[PDB]
Design a binder for this molecule. Structure first.
Ligand SMILES: [Cl-]
Ligand SMILES: [Cl-]
Ligand SMILES: [Cl-]
Ligand SMILES: [Cl-]
Ligand SMILES: [Cl-]
Ligand SMILES: [Cl-]
Ligand SMILES: [Cl-]
Ligand code: NA
Length: 129
């Protein structure tokens, strides 16, 4: 599924991400846009052999099982294929564990380089929320 900007903000709000660990909704929409272009089926392979999956590009080295990342963990206790669903529930539940891990949203390279310190409220402007 390819989400619209406001469609995705509403879905994230209903799943409890607005001000989760102090990050306003616009931070989460900004991260999704530059990680996946709002596509739940996005994958990307890394140099180390791990793969990033879904709307928030969650990595198989730590967070999910894909059957081909030797010596990796599965901290969200899910197959990586669950993160490519049209239903964002698994991705949102896993993202809550990541953002709690000590580095906040700096875990997402595109958030640190393209969203942090910007007017992120722009990402939910005009939306009925
Ligand atoms: Cl957009
Ligand atoms: Cl915001
Ligand atoms: Cl594995
Ligand atoms: Cl594990
Ligand atoms: Cl699993
Ligand atoms: Cl959903
Ligand atoms: Cl933080
Ligand atoms: Na893994």
């Amino acid at each position: 599924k390819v989400f619209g900007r406001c469609e995705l903000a509403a879905a994230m709000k209903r799943h409890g991400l607005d001000n989760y660990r102090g990050y306003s909704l616009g931070n989460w929409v900004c991260a999704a846009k530059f990680e996946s272009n709002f596509n739940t089926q996005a994958t990307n392979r890394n140099t180390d052999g791990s793969t990033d999956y879904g709307i928030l590009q969650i990595n198989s080295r730590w967070w999910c099982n894909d059957g081909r990342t030797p010596g990796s963990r599965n901290l969200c206790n899910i197959p990586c294929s669950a993160l490519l669903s049209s239903d964002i529930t698994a991705s949102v539940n896993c993202a809550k564990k990541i953002v709690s891990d000590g580095n906040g949203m700096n875990a997402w390279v595109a958030w640190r380089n393209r969203c942090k310190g910007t007017d992120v409220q722009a990402w939910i402007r005009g939306c009925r929320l």
